[PDB]
Each structure stands twice: as C-alpha cells, then as structure tokens.
C-alpha cells in the first residue's frame, strides 16, 4: 500500500526479485516484470500458484483460478491471467498511469555496482530513483561484507598491539583504514559486546595497532567480529532546495568581528541569506576556524557540528575548547571525545556524527568532508535535520569515499555524491581565503595543479620540501605493499640529515608503512586517514605509481599536511615534472 517508486501512483505491489521491495503500480509493475528477470511480485498475497506441490512463481504464467493463483497445470476450468493488458490485476487497476524512466530502474535493479557506469547512473538518475539506488547499493554492500573471520584476540602486547588472530580458513581482513570491528567478551555463560575499533597494520610482523571508542582496557579472549548493520528506507532527497533570502532570516548579526575569523566574516553574511552555503574548502585551511568563527558570529543561532566519523569531530572539539564555551555545547556519542553533554538535542552547539544524531531541527548545521559522504547519508541527514541554513564543508579535490565495490573505472570528484556534483557546476558559495596550514611551497603547486591557482601562497618558499627521483622496484603479496629498494633508499636518505627522524612515514598501503616502521622506525600515516593530522616534517614514498596512489587530489590532501617540509619519494614523472619542489637524486 503506497505510491509506486516509478509513478507515484498508489499501488500495493513489490517486486519479489528486488531485495528492497519497491512499490510498483500495475502498469509500471508489468513493465518491470517484462523488462528484467523480475518474475517475482509480492502483494497482499504472494503471486505464487498456491496449489499442492506447485512451484511456479512468475506472474505471466499465473492465472486467477478461483480464489487461488494457479498455473495451467493446476488451474480449474475457469482462470484469469494476472500479468495481462500491460498492467497486472490488483489494487486500483484503473489509475496506473505508467512510467517513462523504466530501463534505468531495471538497470539499477540488476547492476552489480562493479563498473564505474553503475555509480555514474546512481549519481545521475532522478531523485527517488537515486534514493532507491543508494538504498540497494547500501544493502548489497552490507550483505557482501559478511564472509570474513573472527578476530580472536591473542597475545596482547602493550596497549597498542593486541597481535590479534584469525579463524584459519575464512578471514580476509582489510585491517587498513576505517574498517570497524566490534569486540565481544564472554562472561561465564553470557556474552556482551565491548565497542567498535578500527584496527591498523602496525609495526613488524603482527604488532597490529588498534584504535576506537569504549575507553576500557583490553583482555585476551575478547574476540572481534566485523560489524554489520541493516538498511532503513530513506525518505528525504539528497539536498534541500536552495533559496536566497533578502535578509538573515531567523538570525541576528554579530556585535563584534573577530580578527582570525574576519576573513571568514566576509563569508558569514551570505550563509544567512541563502538556504545552504557550498564551500570548496581547501585541505585543512582553517575549516574548523570557519566553523568556530560562525559560532561566535551567530551566538544566538543553534548550530550542529556533524560529520561522517567522530575523528572529524575531534578537530571540531579541539577548536571548541579553543574558543567555544563548554556550557552551550553538546557532544553526542552513541554506545571518542565526550567533553560536552552526550546525546542532548537541546543545545546551542551540537557535536555528533551521521550515525547517532536523531531527528531534530536547528538554525544552521555544518557538515564536513562532504567528499567523504555519500548521497545515501546525504539524504539521511536531510531526513534527520531541517535546519534553517545548511553548509557543506569539503572539496572533492581532497579524497573520495572508499567504494570497495567499485572495481571497474573511476568515479569523478563531482560524481562522489550530489553535493560534490554541484561543487563543479555551481561551485562554492564561500571560500577559505587565507591558507591556515601550508606555505608557498605546497600551496603554489597544489593551486596550479587542481585548485585553479585560487589558493594564495601563504608563507615563504620552504625549499626543504624535497622531491625525489626514482624509477621503481616494487613487490606485493596478498594485501600488503612492500618496497624494499624504496625502504633502503629512504633509510640512506634519512641518514643524510638526522633531523628527518621526526618526519612521519606516509604510505598508500599501511603495510608499506609497517615495513618502514620495522626498518625506518617512523610512524604510520594513511594517505586516506590524513586529514586533520599534520606535521611540519613528513616523509612519504609513493610505493606504487598507480591511479590509487598517483591521482592528483590524493597527493594534494597528502601534501597539504606538510607544514614546513615534505620528503616525497615518487616513482612517476607526471607529478615530478609538474612539481616545482626542490629536486634531489636517488640514494
């Protein structure tokens, strides 16, 4: 009972072949049945021949034989075909108008979401078609990630390296990046979860580093299981309609303009005359400064600082304790940082994530790393918050979401989601003028590279940001990257200047950083998990020159973390000749 997802016409039927059970009206249901292998349709009664011992389920072969669906073998003398006249018999058989966008729905209902074209369709279809496509993609991705091992914790070394274990013939654990694992500790005869943890590659051979919430200790026998969830039918669209007001509706201007946020104050007015403000936020250039300056700019407006992961809200909390009074601040964390009141929608400043905040409505809500976000979550947030103003902090020239199912082709920075799609068509509305992190060295190169020279060269030319020439001798295994010639090269180069024994080692795959820390001793940094984390001295080796380690935005976000100097060892020349850095030889 409801409006069909292809016609908005009131129907009662759902395709049995589709996992998501989409409402389809008689005309559009018939079209979808005949357009794919969707011979299963669910209604008040499941469209199956309810005869003793029968198995036929297709609506085309089914006949309304009396008060029972029947095939030809089990039909009584009187029968009636359901799948007929281009509209299967059912509720409101007259008012089924039919649809035009049918084949896109069929391809959405049948694509495995492996080719890049599937995601192109997912980001280029109609509104509700895009919503349903995101729903189906989420369901498929969740049900795919349930064929792995149980991380039985054994030989806990210190408070970083539990050393883990696996259940022999099953585990395929991608310990890299944000792969959430929950821990279960068995007490007597009962068992109970502990909390989610991310896990990381870590030093040497099995000293795997962990990190997460649940500030408890750890114990042996607390086996970890890869988390899974359930999909909920989205309601809201990707983005609310945009309208520009003639005045700051519902807010009042500021009584004092702070100097550090004055450059952001020039953008703190137009956030108030439009429904939402789009920002091509440069990597780490005081986006948190913009957020806290807006908070101080509108102290009477109720603001929600939301983000995909809580580590993104970590910098928000840092800048909050920098300037935001603790009294009017909430830090919602489900069962990370908790220095505010937890799970309290009644607050001036609200800190939370996309997975824990319930339904609410504010005046302005900030949402960061919109490049990291997906249109599914971009609609979830709309189905949870109806704030007077929105703002989407994030530049698709920073990082994509890890679409692990995306195997064929690559997704464009605009095609990450809808808000990043308009990041190139309508572009930004405000912009972070002053560069709060990088000097002229990195800023000039990244601005001439992809930011269209709009990033002002902030500090002086570093001249310690060495670019290293190397050809490549690389070896790999099951899931780990190893570059022994590169490890030796960076060992030789690091010995030339002992001051570089503080530069963190960055790696496209954190197992290359693991073998480095086994030989180099420098800490590990994911090129993906690099935003926020920043150091004056950094050393990074490309390991491989492939698109997953040589795309422009990836190394942009990796290099925008170098405050003073970066030791970038690359095996390629597309960026080497593009880079205007200080060129050095090969150790």
């Amino acid at each position: 009972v409801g409006a069909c997802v292809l016609c908005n016409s009131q129907t009662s039927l759902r395709c049995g072949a589709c996992i998501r059970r989409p409402f389809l009206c008689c005309k559009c249901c018939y079209d979808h049945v005949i357009s794919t292998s969707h011979k299963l349709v669910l209604s008040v009664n499941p469209y199956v021949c309810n005869a003793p011992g029968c198995d036929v389920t297709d609506v085309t072969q089914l006949y309304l034989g009396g008060m029972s669906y029947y095939c030809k073998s089990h039909k009584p003398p009187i029968s009636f075909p359901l799948c007929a006249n281009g509209q299967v018999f059912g509720l409101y058989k007259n008012t089924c108008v039919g649809s035009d966008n049918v084949t896109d729905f069929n391809a959405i209902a049948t694509c495995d979401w492996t080719n890049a074209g599937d995601y192109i369709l997912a980001n280029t279809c109609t509104e509700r078609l895009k919503l349903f496509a995101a729903e189906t993609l989420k369901a498929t991705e969740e049900t795919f990630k349930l064929s792995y091992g149980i991380a039985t914790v054994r030989e806990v070394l210190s408070d970083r390296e539990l050393h883990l274990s696996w259940e022999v013939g099953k585990p395929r654990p991608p310990l890299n990046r944000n792969y959430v694992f929950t821990g279960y500790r068995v007490t007597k005869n009962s068992k109970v979860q502990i909390g989610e943890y991310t896990f990381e590659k870590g030093d040497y051979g099995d000293a795997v580093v962990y990190r997460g919430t649940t500030t408890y200790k750890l114990n042996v026998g607390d086996y970890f299981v890869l988390t899974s969830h359930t999909v909920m039918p989205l309601s809201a669209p990707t983005l609310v309609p945009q309208e520009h007001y003639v005045r700051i509706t519902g807010l009042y201007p500021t009584l004092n303009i702070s100097d550090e946020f004055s450059s952001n104050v020039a953008n703190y007015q137009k956030v108030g005359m439009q429904k939402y403000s789009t920002l091509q936020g440069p990597p780490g250039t005081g986006k948190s400064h913009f957020a806290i300056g807006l908070a101080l700019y509108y102290p009477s407006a109720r603001i929600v600082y939301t983000a995909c992961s809580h580590a993104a809200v970590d910098a928000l909390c840092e800048k909050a304790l920098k300037y935001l009074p603790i009294d009017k601040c909430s830090r919602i964390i489900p069962a990370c940082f908790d220095k505010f009141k937890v799970n309290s929608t009644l607050e001036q400043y609200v800190f939370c994530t996309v997975n824990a905040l319930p339904e609410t409505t504010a005046d302005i809500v900030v949402f960061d790393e919109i490049s990291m976000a997906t249109n599914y979550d971009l609609s979830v947030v709309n189905a949870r918050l109806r704030a007077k103003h929105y703002v989407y902090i994030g530049d698709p020239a920073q990082l994509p979401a890890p679409r692990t199912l995306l195997t064929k082709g690559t997704l464009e920075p605009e095609y990450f989601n809808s808000v990043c799609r308009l990041m190139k068509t309508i572009g930004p509305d405000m912009f972070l003028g002053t560069c709060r992190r990088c000097p002229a060295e990195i800023v000039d190169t990244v601005s001439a590279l992809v930011y269209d020279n709009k990033l002002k060269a902030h500090k002086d030319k570093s001249a310690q940001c060495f670019k290293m020439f190397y050809k490549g001798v690389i070896t790999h295994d099951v899931s780990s990257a190893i570059n022994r010639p590169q490890i030796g090269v960076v060992r030789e180069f690091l010995t030339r200047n002992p001051a570089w024994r503080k530069a963190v080692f960055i790696s496209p795959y954190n197992s290359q950083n693991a073998v480095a820390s086994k030989i180099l001793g420098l800490p590990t940094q994911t090129v993906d998990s690099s935003q926020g984390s920043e150091y004056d001295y950094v050393i990074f080796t490309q390991t491989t020159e492939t698109a997953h380690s040589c795309n422009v935005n990836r190394f942009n976000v990796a290099i925008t973390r170098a405050k003073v100097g970066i030791l970038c060892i690359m095996s390629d020349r597309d960026l080497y000749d593009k880079l205007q850095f200080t060129s050095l030889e090969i150790p």
């Binding site: 806990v156 500790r185 007490t187 007597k188 009962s190 109970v192 502990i194 500030t215 408890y216 200790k217 114990n219 042996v220 069962a335 908790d338």
Partner: protein, 267 residues
C-alpha cells in the same frame, strides 16, 4: 600545594593533615589479589599512587578516616565517573568525587574517596591466613583499633596460642559483627550491580573494613537488569575466617539483636 588540599577537602569538615607530602604519592605495603594474564596470585605488594590524608577530629586527635586521592589517565576518569554515576544509590558504595587539578601546567584528573578505613579486608584475611608471631604488627593494630583488647594484652606470652591461653577465642569474638555487616553490604552491592547491568568481579582488597566499596575500573556495561557479578574468589578466600571469628552468633538471638534473649526453640 595547599589549594590542592583545600580542593580535595570538599565539604565535609576541614580536619585534614597530609600523611603524604603535598603532591607526592605516599607509598605503602599492602596485601593484594590480582589476576591479569601476565601475573596471578594473592600476596603483599607496594601501593604507590595514593596521596593519603588522614582526617582528624576535634582537639586535633586522629581517627580512622582517610581521604585517599588518586591520579590516573583521562579515559579512566570519564569511565569511572560514568559508572559511579550509575550506581550512586546503594548504601554499599563509599562516597566518591571527581575533579581535575592544576599542580603545574597539566590538566591531570583526580579521584577522591572519602571516609575510608586504614586497612582493607584483604589485609585482615592475609593477616590470619599467613600468621607469623615474628611479624604480627598489622593484626595487633587492627585488634587495638576497634577496642578488641587493650595493648597490654600483648605482654602475656602465648596470647596468640590456642592451646595455651584459650581466652584468645574470646578476643576474636569481637570481630564477627563487622564481618557479618560486610557480608550484608556485599549482598546489597551485588544486587545493585545486577539491577543496573554491570559485569565484573570483586576482591577483598577493594572493600573497606566497614563494607563500603570503590575501584570500579574494570566494570563494563550491559542491558540493565542483566548484570552478572562473579564472587567465587571473594567468598572462597574469606571462608575460613567465619568460624574462626564466630560471625553468625547473632543469628541465635531473638531478632538478630545482640541485646536480646535467645530464640526459645521447641524441644
């Protein structure tokens, strides 16, 4: 320095004298039971991070009331504060307090436990299950503290012998009621944890000599009303003391009242 003392002494009187040294954690030699992968056993140990402040009384006389204050990491601070917030109703929990002091340019957290006892249960258990006449200062102190006997009693030799001087039994008699009270409070506390959904274990070293509890470091959370305690080690270790001190002698009185006649049983 002194402002740290003033902050620690929150609202209850001001009769504190620092047994430690300002911000220095005084070290003590105490009995402990601990089992964590690397080590396991029940024997004496050296406690370090415990700034002890013995509260005195009017006329500057000392009394058994020690405002132990402990410093630790930040995650532990929040975890303990949450858990103590859950269970701050049962009369079996010693009063707690949470704040963060600035000894230097360091936001180090603090945890305050007020009106404790100088010795824990584990000390009393280990004092009798490991008796040695050559080193029995702790037992003498415990006995003289609660008016079990006068200190002059330790001059007549073989006071600690059973066969000679059987009066030693009548001295151990005046410790049963304390153990019975401790058992009652343990039952109350266990009921509270199972009510609010706590999973963990208990040990004699955490309970004072009045029954109050503390040290909720290793407790996890579940769905409320499904918390399961573990008490096998507690009871098994405490078990031999009960007959030795004659804990349950009150049960034969009219209404478990020491000032009441005997229950007149039918023949």
């Amino acid at each position: 320095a002194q402002s740290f003392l003033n902050r620690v002494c929150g609202v209850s009187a001001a009769r504190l004298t620092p047994c430690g040294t300002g911000t220095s954690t005084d070290v003590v030699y105490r009995a402990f039971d601990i089992y964590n992968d690397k080590v396991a056993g029940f024997a004496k140990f050296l406690k370090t991070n415990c700034c002890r402040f013995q509260e005195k009384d009017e006329d500057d006389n000392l009394i058994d009331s020690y405002f132990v204050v402990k410093r630790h990491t930040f995650s532990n601070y929040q975890h303990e504060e949450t858990i103590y917030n859950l269970l701050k109703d049962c009369p079996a929990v010693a009063k707690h307090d949470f704040f963060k002091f600035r000894i230097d340019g360091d936001m180090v957290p603090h945890i305050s436990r007020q009106r404790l006892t100088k010795y824990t249960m584990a000390d009393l258990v280990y004092a009798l299950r490991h008796f040695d006449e050559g080193n029995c200062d702790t037992l003498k102190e415990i006995l003289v503290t609660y008016n079990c006997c006068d200190d002059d009693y330790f001059n007549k030799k073989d006071w600690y012998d059973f066969v000679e001087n059987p009066d030693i039994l009548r001295v151990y008699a005046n410790l049963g009621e304390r153990v019975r009270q401790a058992l009652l409070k343990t039952v109350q506390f266990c009921d509270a944890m199972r009510n609010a959904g706590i999973v963990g274990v208990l040990t004699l070293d955490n309970q004072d000599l009045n029954g109050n509890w503390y040290d909720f470091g290793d407790f996890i959370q579940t769905t409320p009303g499904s918390g399961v305690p573990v008490v096998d080690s507690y009871y098994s270790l405490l078990m031999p003391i009960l007959t030795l001190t004659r804990a349950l002698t009150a049960e034969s009185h009219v209404d478990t009242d020491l000032t009441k006649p005997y229950i007149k049983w039918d023949l």
